[PDB]
Design an enzyme around this catalytic site. Structure first.
Site, PDB file in Angstrom:
ATOM      1  N   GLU E  64       0.832  -1.190   0.000  1.00  0.00           N
ATOM      2  CA  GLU E  64       0.000   0.000   0.000  1.00  0.00           C
ATOM      3  C   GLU E  64       0.872   1.248   0.000  1.00  0.00           C
ATOM      4  OE1 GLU E  64      -2.588  -0.422   3.346  1.00  0.00           O
ATOM      5  OE2 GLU E  64      -4.291  -1.099   2.137  1.00  0.00           O
ATOM      6  N   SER E 133       5.076  -8.571  10.933  1.00  0.00           N
ATOM      7  CA  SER E 133       3.987  -8.786  11.875  1.00  0.00           C
ATOM      8  C   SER E 133       3.068  -9.861  11.315  1.00  0.00           C
ATOM      9  CB  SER E 133       3.215  -7.492  12.128  1.00  0.00           C
ATOM     10  OG  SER E 133       2.512  -7.084  10.966  1.00  0.00           O
ATOM     11  N   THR E 172      -6.325  -5.739  17.491  1.00  0.00           N
ATOM     12  CA  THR E 172      -6.788  -4.814  16.473  1.00  0.00           C
ATOM     13  C   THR E 172      -7.310  -5.530  15.239  1.00  0.00           C
ATOM     14  OG1 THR E 172      -6.178  -2.850  15.188  1.00  0.00           O
ATOM     15  CG2 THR E 172      -4.554  -4.623  15.345  1.00  0.00           C
ATOM     16  N   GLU E 247      27.294 -15.730  17.015  1.00  0.00           N
ATOM     17  CA  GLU E 247      27.262 -16.295  18.363  1.00  0.00           C
ATOM     18  C   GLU E 247      26.018 -15.858  19.130  1.00  0.00           C
ATOM     19  OE1 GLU E 247      31.627 -15.257  19.038  1.00  0.00           O
ATOM     20  OE2 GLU E 247      31.367 -16.921  20.447  1.00  0.00           O
TER      21      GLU E 247
HETATM   22  N1  GTP Z   1       4.500  -2.794  17.721  1.00  0.00           N
HETATM   23  C1  GTP Z   1       3.630  -2.240  16.886  1.00  0.00           C
HETATM   24  N2  GTP Z   1       2.803  -3.033  16.126  1.00  0.00           N
HETATM   25  C2  GTP Z   1       1.918  -2.469  15.275  1.00  0.00           C
HETATM   26  C3  GTP Z   1       1.836  -1.096  15.156  1.00  0.00           C
HETATM   27  N3  GTP Z   1       0.883  -0.813  14.249  1.00  0.00           N
HETATM   28  C4  GTP Z   1       0.366  -1.973  13.787  1.00  0.00           C
HETATM   29  N4  GTP Z   1       0.990  -3.008  14.425  1.00  0.00           N
HETATM   30  C5  GTP Z   1       0.755  -4.446  14.225  1.00  0.00           C
HETATM   31  O1  GTP Z   1       0.063  -4.682  13.016  1.00  0.00           O
HETATM   32  C6  GTP Z   1      -0.784  -5.795  13.188  1.00  0.00           C
HETATM   33  C7  GTP Z   1      -1.970  -5.739  12.237  1.00  0.00           C
HETATM   34  O2  GTP Z   1      -1.598  -6.172  10.947  1.00  0.00           O
HETATM   35  P1  GTP Z   1      -2.138  -5.381   9.654  1.00  0.00           P
HETATM   36  O3  GTP Z   1      -3.224  -4.414  10.051  1.00  0.00           O
HETATM   37  O4  GTP Z   1      -2.667  -6.367   8.641  1.00  0.00           O
HETATM   38  O5  GTP Z   1      -0.866  -4.608   9.048  1.00  0.00           O
HETATM   39  P2  GTP Z   1      -0.069  -5.257   7.814  1.00  0.00           P
HETATM   40  O6  GTP Z   1       0.658  -6.514   8.225  1.00  0.00           O
HETATM   41  O7  GTP Z   1       0.876  -4.238   7.227  1.00  0.00           O
HETATM   42  O8  GTP Z   1      -1.226  -5.582   6.750  1.00  0.00           O
HETATM   43  P3  GTP Z   1      -2.079  -4.385   6.116  1.00  0.00           P
HETATM   44  O9  GTP Z   1      -2.680  -3.591   7.245  1.00  0.00           O
HETATM   45  O10 GTP Z   1      -3.164  -4.952   5.241  1.00  0.00           O
HETATM   46  O11 GTP Z   1      -1.177  -3.502   5.296  1.00  0.00           O
HETATM   47  C8  GTP Z   1      -1.225  -5.747  14.637  1.00  0.00           C
HETATM   48  O12 GTP Z   1      -1.311  -7.047  15.168  1.00  0.00           O
HETATM   49  C9  GTP Z   1      -0.130  -4.980  15.338  1.00  0.00           C
HETATM   50  O13 GTP Z   1       0.603  -5.850  16.166  1.00  0.00           O
HETATM   51  C10 GTP Z   1       2.664  -0.295  15.913  1.00  0.00           C
HETATM   52  O14 GTP Z   1       2.593   0.925  15.812  1.00  0.00           O
HETATM   53  N5  GTP Z   1       3.562  -0.870  16.779  1.00  0.00           N
END
Ligand code: GTP
Ligand code: GTP
Ligand code: GDP
Ligand code: GDP
Ligand code: MG
Lengths: 91, 433, 430, 423, 432
Positions: E64, E133, E172, E247
């Site tokens: 995106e 993620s 989320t 290591e």
């Molecule tokens: N640590 C951290 N994780 C985030 C943050 N924003 C989003 N996430 C992670 O993003 C995950 C959601 O995945 P998605 O909404 O599909 O994001 P994506 O993998 O890029 O896929 P798309 O949203 O379709 O582009 C959640 O489980 C969060 O853990 C952030 O600001 N900090």
């Protein structure tokens, strides 16, 4: 100023038309040369063998003043006061 | 005392040429006005001293269609070329090759031949020739065949360099271009020692993928082409660490007398924007030179082994930079050489940076390199073009015009074996022992 | 008296020739203007070996430049010390060889070799007493190999009693500069082996091998390599032009090195040599000199000495040394490499001491010996000519200048026979 | 004459050497620039024992540092006294073994060990008469251990006539620094026993207590730890460089310290260390006063034999009396079938800054426990094949792994039975 | 002569680096525009030009343009090399089927092209770093496929993986169970090591220590960036015992199959004005093992430890380190296994950690980054499996994936994959 496609704020508003796209990072500076120049090694192959410098030796340590004798010639000269002793030691 | 004349034929041949002199004119010093700026004598290869003052570049422009000729003589470049050298016809061939090879060109080649000798007289170290033209044009090809045919008998052992732009596999500008495409392949094969691909389709991509020119025009492509030409003439007008003469060009890129087609590639080519964050190291730059997308020919190098590549280097490049990066070229497994070629590398070194036309998209860089080589994958274009022929001829569509223009029916048939014979030559060469 | 003339051909000949006289001149104390400016009288005694006598008391080296590309010489004139060369010794063409040994050795050079030999025969009669020849040329190029060997063929035909030194930069497979390297080497090797009496083969890559690790300089350039090679050859006749304990001329070095009539292949070595860091910590002695001498990384050839068994060993130091200690130094070394040294002849290492060192240092050595390892170079060159020969690749050019297939098969034959006989003595047992 | 070369490998080897010469460098009063500024005439008389001759009057140690990781080499150079070493003698790789013993023993070593081997003969060949090789290494450190043992094996074959000396620091349970500790140690002894002739063990954890309990220094750092071994070091070769009543070449002690063929691991100590001293104050701390740098407790077994070194002027009678006194008072810290198993020697130039000092060297049968728990942990890791695949995929197999255990297992039993031997 | 290449994918993977590079930029001292104001340490994470600025070899990927352009319109216009900012057109919308077979491959070719172009520039590649993620479709599909290609292209070259699994209760996403389960199978046998960074556990750490009642996505990031420095610190600067990338995987994995890891960080003192204290290592180390401060919601005490490698950075002396080791072992609340008599790898660096100004961190003369692996880790997987199982019972949400080309059987394959892995953890801890 950036009303329509006239001036620059970001890449989105550029809308490069006609021939090319406007500069972005900082730069077209008109004829700045990009890349690390080369052909630099300093020492030459011919200079290598001919010179062959050496250690050149370091510098010895500097001995301190000898004091016992310092009283010797001081007594020989004929000075015995504290003030005079201040005078002789400097000389 | 070393020089080669330039011959221009056809629309694109002239248009590409204009960029050729603009770049050259800037480099060695001679301004557009022609008066030497307010000696080295290194430009003796391209220009000829007039005795006092300006210089006359060794040029002869030819085209049967007046518009191209007229444009040059009303521009800012009127004070350079000798007015008698612009031989122009009256009626254009209208892309009817037979119009230009049987009925119209014959009345103009003479004056093309006549000025050929005169320019020949002035020179003293005549080394070779250059041909600028395309195949997808009627007027260009018909004259194009005549000059090389005529010149070939007049001189003979004098070398020949071939720069023609074949039509793209998928994009085109005319409808009957393929007929011109093969036919020029019918005669050119018997007079040329070198042949280079310049399919315009590949050229565009270099503007988009790297040049990032969203809406490129013909002008952009021509400017680059002049770079390749100038890229090749550095080792003929300046002192180089390892000089290479025009004799050592068919020397290494022609394993057999017939196979004489090569594909060209130049790099790096970046605008001011991208290049700022780059090192331009010889290791990477030579790494890019073999990138499947940088080559100027829309062919798949991965569909065939390599035979022999000759590459020229310019700039502050250091010898230890090339070979070390040269050996790594072999290390890569995706590129597999022909069995009978223990080595296929030819190296060129010089101390002149690359010149950039002012106000253009190119940007200065200390180091640059150009790549020219012969590979077994070229056959596809002839492979693809040849099959397109049987679609045209299957019902003899458009046959009614060429035949009556002066060309016999059998002429098309004979070229088929020449094209058909050429195909087997490639297929036979690659076979390992 | 007891001198030699200098002829260099091809770009290689001019670069080393331009470098070669650079190294010699500074040792003789004569400015590029041809005027002697040495500090010790000893610089003069053998000054006639390399120079003639002309008006004004100035001097001029006895060199002639030959090639079929003028640019090679022109780049030599404007260079420093380039005013020493005699313009009358300049000769050139205008056609270019295209790296074609057929064109150079059959079409143009023969038409151009007349001028050189005529001038070539000039000094030979001019010199009071010719002692031999020395010709540097590149076997991997077009113009040098042909006119270099063709000039070799003609000159020998008149002075069969003289001597010749051949310095050649043979091409190794690691670094390549042309697509016709395998072929042009073969043809030249055919003529040299039949006419050359003493020849030196130098590998550019190894020259990188010596510089990169020993020299350790940041980035060598074409200027750098020339110094070393010129330095090595320049010391070849070192003892000749200066008083010494055991005079060693080109003739004497001839006797002690070539055991058999055809095996005229050697490798040279120079020392001391090391990086800047070693300048102020390493120790210089005859034992220190010698060890560098035998190091496998010192000889300027790609052939590995451990891959062969040494046949002959002659050492050329410079300066003042005690003959005894060098005696053991060469004596003991022969003891610890018996398997690597010829067994059917004892005492296969020679000692040569000339009182005069090279300027800038007090210990120096030039290493020249015979070992079988060179067969690796010739062999690897053997297939490359063959490997592309089966399909006749790139032959249509060669057949296109009055040459046919008949001779080519001959050229392959001699080397293959040449390599075997050289190796034949490898398995020989007493 | 009777000069000795030095070769070190691994981070422990590199760092320790950088100071060891520093301790020595202070001994003969030789500047980092390499010019002599000493006082005593005897100072320059044997300098060939550790220094070569270089143009201009500078002297260079015959030491070469070998490692597979660049961290030490570039780090060691920057420090003071980092310019004496030959710039050419340095050899370094570009990968580092990552504490993978087999990696530095079979694969990484086999390709780079040529350079280290290359330099080794050149230094020796210049020696008038080889006296020995001194090698420092750690059995708990990966990269150095992998190449060090192979070097030990490589040295012996070509030079079966010279005496070899090696140094090892075997990790202990108290201070554990790498999970791969158990495997690396076990194979280290197998080749070390087979190849190495003289080996002196130092337990890192032991060092801490000495500084805390005797030195009482607030903060113990690696730099401070390195110095303690340096003091003991010179005592090994102290007399070899200076005159004395009864000089003791390295071979003499070996002859007088090694009773049997496969008992070649010794415990050492140094004194005096403090936060007018007479001879008696030395002896008590000599066999007592927690001065042993090894976790083994010599009170836990019997002594095969011991040697003592005295530096500075003293009356040998006291040297004889004290030695006799200690043997009787500490019978059972001496087994019956080795009567009078103490060796002694005297030198007339003691450390710079200390009047009288002693270095402990006595073959103690208690060292068996050093193999014991080091053996103990090894089986635990092996039993479940924990971390076994690393060595498996780099040329070794489980077949080799067991072989060491038997050799060590046979090693302990034979070594143990010498404690219970009776006449 | 030591370098690394940074790979960031997905908005979670893309965003995390942003705090990562900003912390990195501040740490080395490079200006935001890249021009040095007013050595060679940058060579570890920067390369010369070599007359001018410096650039991180970071590659940013996503399907995106919304996330990508903000970097082209955020406060960091300049640093990153534009040619490496390959971006797609459409997103998979948490659809592993769409993000792994439909549009992902249309950009898989280009990324590796830039990856190779980055590899040749340096010479001392020890290993890459991969971020992703699992709780997303676009990240899952692209990340797993990219990981698959990398191994075959190179092979033995090391790789480090930083995943972020869904939180136990707060999510989320609503389809995370489907994407996450499949994602595990792809990465189980294609990346050597990985760690756990569950979201919730990140939330708690800030509250209990930093004392902020208004934490958003922003704050967590600096936690992520902070961690990397602790692990990488030994790769750039002097230390009493430096440690390298190789290591970390050769010391922490008992057998080939069990290769997951877990993270910790402390102390984390809030930016107050109190006099604080000196925070001696001995007391700091104790804070690294208490479960509440643990970086993930996997109670270590619920299970048992396997092997721990600890990093101390600042002004720590080894002596304090060695003593701290035993005292931890002394406590009965923690047990080490019969087959691992010693399981500690200790690395001491010299630099005091650099704190990004304007965040919430503070300047502390000491610190520690505890990285340990324990059998208890199965708890997070156990909870994930149950969530997955319930949905598939009635064939829910399956239809939106099959029609996009993903075959039907694999769901059986992955599920058995976790069960095989779940059983594997159980057998390792069996007492001998
Ligand atoms: N640590 C951290 N994780 C985030 C943050 N924003 C989003 N996430 C992670 O993003 C995950 C959601 O995945 P998605 O909404 O599909 O994001 P994506 O993998 O890029 O896929 P798309 O949203 O379709 O582009 C959640 O489980 C969060 O853990 C952030 O600001 N900090
Ligand atoms: N490189 C380049 N090629 C061009 C340009 N303009 C035309 N061409 C080439 O010219 C080819 C066709 O030739 P023609 O258009 O027939 O020109 P001609 O051969 O002189 O024949 P006429 O059309 O009768 O004038 C096309 O396929 C193009 O590839 C240009 O601006 N740059
Ligand atoms: N050392 C050194 N070797 C060179 C130089 N120039 C060319 N050569 C060698 O000469 C070879 C090229 O031969 P070439 O000049 O074409 O042969 P020619 O045309 O017959 O004179 C290369 O393989 C190089 O190894 C130089 O400047 N220095
Ligand atoms: N005495 C001492 N021991 C050290 C020092 N540095 C490291 N060690 C020990 O060396 C072992 C690790 O060795 P290592 O540094 O990996 O050696 P290398 O990798 O081969 O160079 C650890 O068990 C430490 O106890 C030091 O400065 N002094
Ligand atoms: Mg036209």
């Amino acid at each position: 100023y950036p009303w329509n496609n006239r001036t620059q704020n970001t890449l989105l508003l550029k809308d490069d038309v006609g021939r090319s796209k406007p500069s972005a990072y900082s730069l077209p500076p008109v004829d700045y040369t990009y890349g690390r120049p080369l052909e630099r090694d300093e020492e030459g192959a011919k200079e290598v063998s001919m010179t062959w410098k050496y250690h050149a030796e370091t510098r010895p340590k500097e001995p301190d003043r000898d004091f016992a004798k310092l009283n010797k010639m001081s007594l020989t000269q004929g000075l015995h006061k504290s003030n005079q002793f201040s005078d002789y030691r400097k000389r | 005392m070393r020089e080669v004349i330039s011959i221009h034929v056809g629309q694109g041949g002239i248009q590409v040429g204009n960029a050729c002199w603009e770049l050259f004119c800037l480099e060695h010093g001679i301004q557009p006005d022609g008066q030497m700026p307010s000696g080295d004598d290194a430009f003796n290869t391209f220009f000829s001293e007039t005795g006092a003052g300006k210089h006359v570049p060794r040029a002869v422009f030819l085209d049967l269609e007046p518009t191209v000729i007229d444009e040059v003589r009303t521009g800012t470049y009127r004070q350079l070329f000798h007015p008698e050298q612009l031989i122009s016809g009256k009626e254009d061939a209208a892309n009817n090759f037979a119009r230009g090879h049987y009925t119209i060109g014959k009345e103009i080649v003479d004056l093309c031949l006549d000025r050929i000798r005169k320019l020949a007289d002035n020179c003293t170290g005549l080394q070779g020739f250059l041909v600028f033209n395309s195949v997808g044009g009627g007027t260009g090809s018909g004259l194009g065949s005549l000059l090389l045919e005529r010149l070939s008998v007049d001189y003979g052992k004098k070398s020949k360099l071939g720069f023609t732009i074949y039509p793209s596999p998928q994009v085109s500008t005319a409808v009957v271009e393929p007929y011109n495409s093969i036919l020029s392949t019918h005669s050119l094969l018997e007079h040329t020692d070198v042949a280079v691909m310049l399919d315009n389709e590949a050229i565009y991509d270099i503007c988009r993928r790297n040049l990032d020119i969203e809406r490129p025009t013909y002008t952009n492509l021509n400017r680059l082409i002049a770079q390749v030409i100038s890229s090749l003439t550095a080792s003929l007008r300046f002192d180089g660490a390892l000089n290479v003469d025009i004799t050592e060009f068919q020397t290494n890129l022609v394993p057999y007398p017939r196979i004489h087609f090569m594909l060209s590639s130049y790099a790096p080519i970046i605008s001011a924007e991208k290049a700022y964050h780059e090192q331009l190291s010889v290791a990477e730059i030579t790494n890019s030179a073999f990138e499947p997308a940088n080559m100027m020919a829309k062919c798949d190098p991965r569909h065939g082994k390599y035979m022999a590549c000759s590459m020229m280097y310019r700039g502050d490049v250091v010898p230890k930079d090339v070979n070390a990066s040269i050996a790594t070229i072999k290390t890569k497994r995706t590129i597999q050489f022909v069995d009978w070629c223990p080595t296929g590398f030819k190296v060129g070194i010089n101390y002149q940076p690359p010149t950039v036309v002012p106000g253009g998209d190119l940007a200065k860089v200390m180091r640059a390199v150009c790549m020219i080589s012969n590979s077994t994958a070229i056959a596809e274009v002839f492979s693809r073009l040849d099959h397109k022929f049987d679609l045209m001829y299957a019902k003899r569509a458009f046959v009614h015009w060429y035949v009556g223009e002066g060309m016999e029916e059998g002429e098309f048939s004979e070229a088929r074996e020449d094209l058909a014979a050429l195909e087997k030559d490639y297929e036979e060469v690659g076979i390992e022992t | 008296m007891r001198e030699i003339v200098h002829i260099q051909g091809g770009q290689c000949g001019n670069q080393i020739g331009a470098k070669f006289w650079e190294v010699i001149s500074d040792e003789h104390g004569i400015d590029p203007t041809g005027t002697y400016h040495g500090d010790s009288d000893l610089q003069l005694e053998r000054i006639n070996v390399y120079y003639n006598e002309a008006t004004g008391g100035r001097y001029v080296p006895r060199a002639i430049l030959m090639d079929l590309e003028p640019g090679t010489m022109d780049s030599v004139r404007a260079g420093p010390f380039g005013q020493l060369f005699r313009p009358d010794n300049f000769v050139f063409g205008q056609t270019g060889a295209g790296n074609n040994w057929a064109k150079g050795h059959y079409t143009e050079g023969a038409e151009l070799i007349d001028s050189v030999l005529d001038v070539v025969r000039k000094e030979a009669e001019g010199c009071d007493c010719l002692q031999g020849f020395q010709i540097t040329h590149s076997l991997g190029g077009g113009t040098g190999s042909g006119m270099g060997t063709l000039l070799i063929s003609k000159v020998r035909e008149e002075y069969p009693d003289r001597i010749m030194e051949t310095f050649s930069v043979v091409p190794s497979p690691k670094v390549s500069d042309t697509v016709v390297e395998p072929y042009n080497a073969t043809l030249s090797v055919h003529q040299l082996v039949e006419n050359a009496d003493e020849c030196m083969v130098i590998d550019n890559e190894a020259l990188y091998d010596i510089c990169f690790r020993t020299l350790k300089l940041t980035t060598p350039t074409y200027g750098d390599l020339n110094h070393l090679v010129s330095a090595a050859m320049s010391g070849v006749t070192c003892c000749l032009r200066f008083p010494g304990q055991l005079n060693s001329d080109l003739r004497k070095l001839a006797v002690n090195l070539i055991p058999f009539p055809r095996l005229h292949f050697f490798m040279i070595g120079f020392a001391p040599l090391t990086s800047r860091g070693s300048q102020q910590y390493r120790a210089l002695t005859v034992p220190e000199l010698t060890q560098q001498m035998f190091d496998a990384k010192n000889m300027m050839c790609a052939a590995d000495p451990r891959h062969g068994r040494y046949l002959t060993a002659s050492a050329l130091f410079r300066g003042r040394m005690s003959t005894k200690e060098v005696d053991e130094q060469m004596l003991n070394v022969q003891n610890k490499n018996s398997s690597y040294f010829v067994e059917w002849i004892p005492n296969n290492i020679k000692s040569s001491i000339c009182d005069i060192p090279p300027k800038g240092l007090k210990m120096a050595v030039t290493f020249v010996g015979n070992s079988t390892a060179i067969q690796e170079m010739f062999k690897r060159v053997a297939e490359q000519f063959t490997a592309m020969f089966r399909r006749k690749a790139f032959l249509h050019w060669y057949t296109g200048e009055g040459m046919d297939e008949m001779e080519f098969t001959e050229a392959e034959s001699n080397m293959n026979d040449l390599v075997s006989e050289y190796q034949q003595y490898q398995d020989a047992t007493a």
